[PDB]
Symmetry: D2
Amino acid sequence: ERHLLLIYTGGTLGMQSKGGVLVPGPGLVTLLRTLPMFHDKEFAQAQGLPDHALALPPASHGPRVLYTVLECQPLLDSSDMTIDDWIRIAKIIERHYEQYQGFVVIHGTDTMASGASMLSFMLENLHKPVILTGAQVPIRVLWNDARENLLGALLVAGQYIIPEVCLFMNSQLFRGNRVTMVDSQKFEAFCSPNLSPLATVGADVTIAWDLVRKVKWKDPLVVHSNMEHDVALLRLYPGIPASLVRAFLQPPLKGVVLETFGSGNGPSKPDLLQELRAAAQRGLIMVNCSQCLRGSVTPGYATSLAGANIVSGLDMTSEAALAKLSYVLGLPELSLERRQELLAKDLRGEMTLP
Amino acid sequence: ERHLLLIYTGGTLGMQSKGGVLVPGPGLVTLLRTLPMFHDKEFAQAQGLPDHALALPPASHGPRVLYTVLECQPLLDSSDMTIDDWIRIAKIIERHYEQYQGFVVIHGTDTMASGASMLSFMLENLHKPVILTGAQVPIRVLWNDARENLLGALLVAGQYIIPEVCLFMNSQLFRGNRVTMVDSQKFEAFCSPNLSPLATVGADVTIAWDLVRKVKWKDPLVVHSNMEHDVALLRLYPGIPASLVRAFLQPPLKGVVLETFGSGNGPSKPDLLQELRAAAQRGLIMVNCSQCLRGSVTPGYATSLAGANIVSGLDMTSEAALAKLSYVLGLPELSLERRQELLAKDLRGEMTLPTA
Amino acid sequence: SERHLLLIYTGGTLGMQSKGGVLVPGPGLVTLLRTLPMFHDKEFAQAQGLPDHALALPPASHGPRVLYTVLECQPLLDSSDMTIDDWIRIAKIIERHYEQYQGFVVIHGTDTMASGASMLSFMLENLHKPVILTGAQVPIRVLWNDARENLLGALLVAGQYIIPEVCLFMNSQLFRGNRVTMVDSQKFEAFCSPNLSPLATVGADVTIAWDLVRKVKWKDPLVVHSNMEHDVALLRLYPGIPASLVRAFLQPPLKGVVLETFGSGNGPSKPDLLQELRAAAQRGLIMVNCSQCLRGSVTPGYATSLAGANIVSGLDMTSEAALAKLSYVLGLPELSLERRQELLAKDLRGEMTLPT
Amino acid sequence: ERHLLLIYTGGTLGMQSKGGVLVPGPGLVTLLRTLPMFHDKEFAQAQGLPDHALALPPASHGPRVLYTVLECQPLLDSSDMTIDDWIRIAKIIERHYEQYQGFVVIHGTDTMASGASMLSFMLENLHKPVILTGAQVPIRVLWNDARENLLGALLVAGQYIIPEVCLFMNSQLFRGNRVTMVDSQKFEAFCSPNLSPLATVGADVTIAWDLVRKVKWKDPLVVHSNMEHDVALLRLYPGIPASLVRAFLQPPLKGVVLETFGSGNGPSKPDLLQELRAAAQRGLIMVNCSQCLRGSVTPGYATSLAGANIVSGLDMTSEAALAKLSYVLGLPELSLERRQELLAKDLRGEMTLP
Ligand SMILES: NC(=O)C[C@H](N)C(=O)O
Ligand SMILES: NC(=O)C[C@H](N)C(=O)O
Ligand SMILES: NC(=O)C[C@H](N)C(=O)O
Ligand SMILES: NC(=O)C[C@H](N)C(=O)O
């Protein structure tokens, strides 16, 4: 047997109608009991299992998967989620780390990529799978993507030792800190633009073991609650005025991700550059990410954004750059130089160096 | 014969190295003369053509294509381009509209999509092709995408009557107000996420005539120099504080595109909503666009951003929403309600209205 | 407001079981489906005291309630053992019960699914109701599968929409049956419609391409063609293929052949090979030229293009469709060879796009 | 400096109109001289180079590339090409192997994949790049894919040590024995369904060095002219009769690739199986390949084709299986069992083992 904790945070996967809009819906365990694909009643009574614990039917070979549903309260649309919510989740995983062989987190799609990236950083030396999943259509609606997304997540966590925060949707397993949402209606909602999926499910299950990270058995799990809140994201647009940037970068901001044009460029007008420079003197750290979905930030142009306190984000997603910025700035007693060096390193598989 | 104007604004297609970085490079016409694929010397002398005018070799069928190079000054990296630059370009097209059968604009990739969208709006009732093109690698570098991108743009403008601001790159013609940049290194740099290409070039040329807009022969070209400058784009991120939004939306801002999560949603925390409401009372107009590349903004959630002075952008790119916002706000003597109604309408093929 | 469907279970991996360490066809489908809430609403069934043969889907978002009856063919087959006769039997089942039901779903193996869809497309002349083929890469009895959602989707499409075509539903896509081919032997996205958009897509909502879906011909009755010519074949060219091997392949009693050719529709121009094609034509054989390429059309243009006596271009047809069309046309009674060739060159069921 | 041989065999890249159809067109070197992108006149006179030898302009970094055009005669539409033509090409490469650092072969698209795969096998222990290229539109037609396809091939051969028979088209370098033609009109005409490209050209050049084969500097080049001609390809279709298969497999055929359904299956009707068995007793070797573009042949069904003298082709393209069959059967003095063992091995990067 293998034992999993299913953490239900909210999201469309479990929503219900009310006032003609979808809102978070409680009572997930109650529903799941009634579904044979999610709970084997015969086996449960045959082992007289507890009322909190469900049991997946069997695969021919390999371990039986059991899981316990922890329903957060209140449940949230992922658009209302913040760093504090993700810290709460990490702490749940920390509290119960020893009792369970893996974790599945049901989450809304709207900020799924931010959440996956954040947990990726907070959960240092992670040894077990943490699989985020969600859906475009609620599980209570007959034609949905929820059933197979939830089952796949449970089967991955239950059967494979992939020590990473992942996202499972639409028969693909992605590295969590590598994904971003590309489609607001279709079931293929997420893309991992700069890295293959860690796994694919079809007639058989193909895992890219060459990419999956190695379990560091010696080192214990260190959960970082010390994530810096005063970080932001700022997207450049043509003609963006210096005075607006000045305002954006005022104290108490400590870090910012600048989403720039193309290979990592912005306007070279001096008043703008002066503000970035002024912000650096105040001790602000800036990460340069491209607005483009695919490719890497690279120097080469007179418009390339480089300089004091600007670290290139290379091929990072913006969700990952923001989380990494939150993580690095939250570490105690480091110099600015050191912090910049940590930002330029691949810390959780989120960044490919040249 | 068909006559085109080639407007060279800058961009990597024509850049040179200096101090180990790429910068804008002048002297394009001088280079193009020396390249047989871009200038047929034999034919030029046989017709004793002017020194400013180049001539493509014969294509398979149809008319011979001649073109004139207008090299803007100063040439720009597209990251330094603004509304005023795009207005200058529209005015060049206006000045010479009657002398030429079509236009090609060489432009940097960095803000290409913004430029295409802006010109799309400024050039009301356009009857001729305006094809933007660019490259990831300069034409002076041997291994490049510049040669074939420039040639294709000239051949499309020269041979087909597509009355739209388009982007031609990597054997695809896209509707200008429908594109966005998706790859910062690869030659397939742009995507039209919510509309097929207008055309594809291969062994033969396939055009989607069912999508191409109709020439309005009766109506004259109206160029809009009256584009509102005080518009911005603001991307939401989780936990974005109300105080930062307050600062962003201070006067003199008149319009903003909010890039929101998923199907068009944001945080429902009251202090944030309060600021959007306060901005509306100051008369600000807000367009809701999705951060997602593909799909549409749609209501359905308690977190859907809708309300006073918020217009849904449906499936618009953010580049298009920003340009449309600049256009609509620049029109004289309209009420806020009228302006909102215009934003919710498909004005240049940039927006698809939902089905029933 | 109820709609009634017939679910015809022919075999295929969707319903297979292990035996001797290999998958083989598994009976007892209705017994399984009863126990699954997503496939049978027990509460509603007792509330209407329904028959034991008839299952009932839960309520979908809108529209009619869907009821269906399972007909389990015997013997059940791996689709690799299926032939024209099996597909004729299926067509006849649909004929027998045509009046009692509003639509049809056929569970079928993937191995020859495309051939089966194309064949039924031709046999069912003037079809007025949906016939949706579906299958799976993993059996429904195996926990982690594509079977559950593929079967449900097929039932919901047939049950809710009037698409009068033989279709294939897999992996949230509805394809025109005579337009598909199998591209992936392991992944759930197993089929592609290379030269036509899907007829429909399922997501948060259902998008149908009504401007492609064929029109119901309510005047004309259903005519089922049992008269399908069995002596037809498919022959794939490979470089250096010798004339003597082709001679042997095309011996009587063969009446028709699909030649899968290179590129835009080309083959070796060596005379001994051309002589055999010509000899076959004199014996009265008909030949259809299809490209080995997945995407594109057969077109003339090269000295190696295969054209001539009794060779009809297949344009953009799949080879599964060309073979079925060849079987259909050759089975029609009392037509000249010239007439038969004219019919092959026409789009008879939406399988072929004519040039302009 | 680096020196390349450009072998022009024919194909649309160099065709001309005549009688309203395209046919092979001579005089390539004459055309190339007049194009600055393909020949630097200033530099040539500055080094008073020979009349047979062209010189590319300077690329960004590295060596200057010079090349010599060898125009085969007669030139061919690739639909007329056979094993003998490919042997002639291999022999050209063998004759001049020491004088040149790499090779480019201009070839028609129609049988490009068969040609690439054949040369891949004939050129044992190859140490230098051999890059096939072609086009959908002739180079003499103004709007074409020929110019950039030919240049890219020269630049790859000229600048990188990739010791494989490759195909360069549309800014992608593919392993030759891994490609097949998927589009008869579009410039993206070829696909490598079961293997990433070896390289991609964009703003910079990305090579997948983890996939590129290693130069075997100890071992000399062995060219195999001994390629078995009596091999064929047979595609199954539903209901294919046993009597037609009987006829197909008659002597003197020595080997066949059976293109089967799905994961590698065919009809189980006994009269058909009997003929495969009869062919095996005559000593015929059979390779099972899938008709599907993507995936692998695998057992699992009662309809799986396995047995006496049937070797699984796993994820091989059919072009590659046919060439491998031609190669293995041409080797002198091996037992049937040995031959089968060689077929089941990855000999040139054409097959992925489980
Ligand atoms: N499909 C979803 O989950 C969207 C939802 N608004 C959420 O993120 O909570
Ligand atoms: N590829 C390019 O053109 C990038 C350049 N920085 C520009 O936009 O001008
Ligand atoms: N997945 C499948 O259905 C393949 C099976 N051999 C069949 O065609 O019946
Ligand atoms: N485009 C091409 O090269 C096709 C031509 N028929 C050939 O194979 O020679």
